[PDB]
Amino acid sequence: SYAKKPHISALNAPQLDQRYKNEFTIGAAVEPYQLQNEKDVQMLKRHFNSIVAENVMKPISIQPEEGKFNFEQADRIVKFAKANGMDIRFHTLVWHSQVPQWFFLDKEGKPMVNETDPVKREQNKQLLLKRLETHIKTIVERYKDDIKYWDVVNEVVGDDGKLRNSPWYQIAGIDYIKVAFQAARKYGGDNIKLYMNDYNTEVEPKRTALYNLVKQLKEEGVPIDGIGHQSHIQIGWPSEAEIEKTINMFAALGLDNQITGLDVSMYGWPPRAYPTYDAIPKQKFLDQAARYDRLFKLYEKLSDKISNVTFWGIADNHTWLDSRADVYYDANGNVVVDPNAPYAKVEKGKGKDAPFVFGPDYKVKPAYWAIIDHK
Ligand SMILES: O[C@@H]1[C@@H](O)[C@H](O[C@@H]2CO[C@@H](O[C@@H]3CO[C@@H](O[C@@H]4CO[C@H](F)[C@H](O)[C@H]4O)[C@H](O)[C@H]3O)[C@H](O)[C@H]2O)OC[C@H]1O
Ligand SMILES: O[C@@H]1[C@@H](O)[C@H](O[C@@H]2CO[C@H](F)[C@H](O)[C@H]2O)OC[C@H]1O
Ligand SMILES: [Cl-]
Ligand SMILES: [Cl-]
Ligand SMILES: [Zn+2]
Ligand SMILES: [Zn+2]
Ligand SMILES: [Zn+2]
Ligand SMILES: [Zn+2]
Ligand SMILES: [Zn+2]
Ligand SMILES: [Zn+2]
């Protein structure tokens, strides 16, 4: 948008949450250590009114051994949010990653997926579903009065448009999804909001598979209030028109929509990253700002269907996208960023992405000015 506008400190800038406070909340994903960091704390107080745990509320973080519950890190995030009037999202009750393996072992310690006896398979389904309910019950009984929004399940639809064939699904079938939502509603009451969260919600055949799944579950009386759109997107993909079609499609079923992990990568897929932040050309920041301009204009257009937009991080000095920031080198040792160009070797996850509206020195980017204005 406006590259003339200055690279001032974000702690001096107009508040992002206040700009959008009638359209949707503005959230950030955080780690407990960031609440010990003065700049991060100042950023959260100044610009955000919603919060989510990047990692410490995932299944392996909460119950890494059966009966061993570690709420100490999650509590710190809940405490900070309460002290600053922030909404809280719980990420996440059910997932196929960062999930403890003990869930999926039979009574003799052997993987349930290997069982061939159909009578024992059914016993394993019931054992897994009981473990599921106990995990959800313990968490929700603790946090039901503090956490309004819940990622009940994460990434349960595969990119091929079939249900993801995770151990959850191989062992228990579709019922693990139904049990997760029923348990959350039972122990949390009617006032918490239950979400199905996923990436590439805009992309077929996954989009229609997600649509049909939640449609059928609601018809069977499974409580589900909304869809979480992770929105791990690029400067040019997916198109705004497909984002709009996706949001409207789910709103037509009576579901809320939340943007739950927004980042706008500088790269494509698979990414060919620059090795450092300093190496990223200025022009990339301007392409990103125009994309952010279009994207938030669309979010505002649809504000009656979106209750929250959460970024998967605070500022560019910390983003999980760096773990995807592969750097390609040609035979002369020069960096290759052209996605079809020749190259000799790749250094996986050693580069730098730049996905937010706040730079790594906590100063506002062109993308910030692009979304703080009313043009
Ligand atoms: O663990 C998950 C992790 O898997 C997830 O990563 C996503 C995996 O799917 C990727 O989807 C591809 C994105 O790029 C598209 O191609 C674009 C087409 O349009 C333009 F040409 C553009 O330049 C292209 O890049 C592919 O068709 C998609 O399949 C996503 O990018 C990943 O984010 O992230 C969440 C983790 O929890
Ligand atoms: O620190 C990393 C963390 O940020 C990442 O979180 C996932 C990002 O992709 C989606 F949004 C998932 O739902 C998030 O849970 O997980 C890996 C971890 O190392
Ligand atoms: Cl990370
Ligand atoms: Cl900078
Ligand atoms: Zn505020
Ligand atoms: Zn540097
Ligand atoms: Zn709204
Ligand atoms: Zn992180
Ligand atoms: Zn700077
Ligand atoms: Zn704008």
Q: Ligand 2 atom 2: the closest Cα is on which residue?
A: 320
Q: Ligand 2 atom 17: the closest Cα is on which residue?
A: 320
Helical pair 175-188 and 118-143, crossing angle rounded to 10 deg: 30
Q: Ligand 1 atom 21: the closest Cα is on which residue?
A: 237
Q: Give the residue from 160, 228, 165, 164 showing the smallest Cα distance to 198.
A: 228
Q: Ligand 1 atom 36: the closest Cα is on which residue?
A: 199
Question: Which bound ligand lies closest to the C-alpha atom of 25?
Answer: 7
Q: Which atom of ligand 2 is nearest to the CA of 197?
A: 13
Taking the centre of ligand 9 as the mean of its atom positions, its distance from the CA of residue 28, in whole angstroms, is 20
Candidate from 157, 199, 206, 231 with most ligand 1 atoms within 8 A of CB, to mutate: 199
Whether 256 and 197 have beta carbons less than 8 Å apart is answered as: no
- Give, for 234, the enclosing helix (H) or strand (E): strand 232-234
Candidate from 30, 52, 55, 318 with most ligand 2 atoms within 8 A of CB, to mutate: 55
Whether 229 and 259 have beta carbons less than 8 Å apart is answered as: yes
Q: Ligand 1 atom 1: the closest Cα is on which residue?
A: 97
Taking the centre of ligand 10 as the mean of its atom positions, its distance from the CA of residue 81, in whole angstroms, is 28
For residue 45, give both structure tokens. 């107080």
**Residue 332, CB-side half-sphere exposure with 13 Å CA sphere:** 4
Neighbours of 186 (CB within 10 A): 13
Residue 33 CA to residue 15 CA, distance in Å, equals 23
Taking the centre of ligand 9 as the mean of its atom positions, its distance from the CA of residue 238, in whole angstroms, is 28
Distances (CA, A) of 356 to 38, 51, 59, 264: 19, 16, 27, 7
CATH of domain 10-372: 3.20.20.80
For residue 316, give both structure tokens. 């560019």
Q: Are strands 306-311 and 25-30 parallel, antiparallel or unpaired?
A: parallel
For residue 159, give both structure tokens. 């990119």
Q: Which residues have CB under 6 Å of ligand 2?
A: 54-55, 154, 230, 261, 312, 320
Taking the centre of ligand 8 as the mean of its atom positions, its distance from the CA of residue 352, in whole angstroms, is 13
Q: What is the resolution of this structure in A?
A: 2.2
Can you name the residues that pair with 90 across neighbouring β-strands? 150
Distances (CA, A) of 246 to 49, 125, 260, 312: 25, 33, 15, 20
Distances (CA, A) of 157 to 59, 205, 214, 229: 18, 10, 11, 13
Distances (CA, A) of 44 to 35, 39, 66, 72: 9, 9, 34, 20
Can you name the residues that pair with 25 across neighbouring β-strands? 308
How buried is residue 246: exposed, middle or buried, by Cβ count under 10 Å (0-12/13-18/19+)?
buried
Residue 32 CA to residue 201 CA, distance in Å, equals 29
Neighbours of 18 (CB within 10 A): 13
Cis preceding linkage at 270, omega within 30: yes
Taking the centre of ligand 7 as the mean of its atom positions, its distance from the CA of residue 25, in whole angstroms, is 8
Residue 329 CA to residue 100 CA, distance in Å, equals 37
| Sheet with 327-329, side-by-side order of all strands | 335-336, 327-329, 345-347
Q: What are phi and psi of 300, to 5 degrees?
A: -65, -45
Largest interatomic CA distance in the chain: 70
Q: Ligand 2 atom 4: the closest Cα is on which residue?
A: 320
Query: ∠100-105-110 over CA atoms, to 5°?
Result: 135
Candidate from 91, 200, 231, 322 with most ligand 1 atoms within 8 A of CB, to mutate: 200
Whether 228 and 258 have beta carbons less than 8 Å apart is answered as: yes
For residue 112, give both structure tokens. 């349930």
Q: Hunting for tokens 């997760």 — which residue is that?
A: 180
Distances (CA, A) of 172 to 37, 126, 127, 131, 292: 43, 8, 9, 12, 41
Give Cβ neighbours of residue 15 (< 8 Å, ≥ 6 apart): 46, 47
- Protein residues near ligand 3, an ion, with CB under 5 A: 320
Q: Give the residue from 48, 149, 131 showing the smallest Cα distance to 89.
A: 149
Helix, strand or coil, per DSSP, at residue 223: coil
- Within the chain, residue ranges assigned H as helices are 16-19, 38-47, 59-62, 72-83, 118-143, 167-172, 175-188, 206-219, 240-252, 282-301, 366-372
Taking the centre of ligand 9 as the mean of its atom positions, its distance from the CA of residue 182, in whole angstroms, is 48
Can you name the residues that pair with 311 across neighbouring β-strands? 28, 262
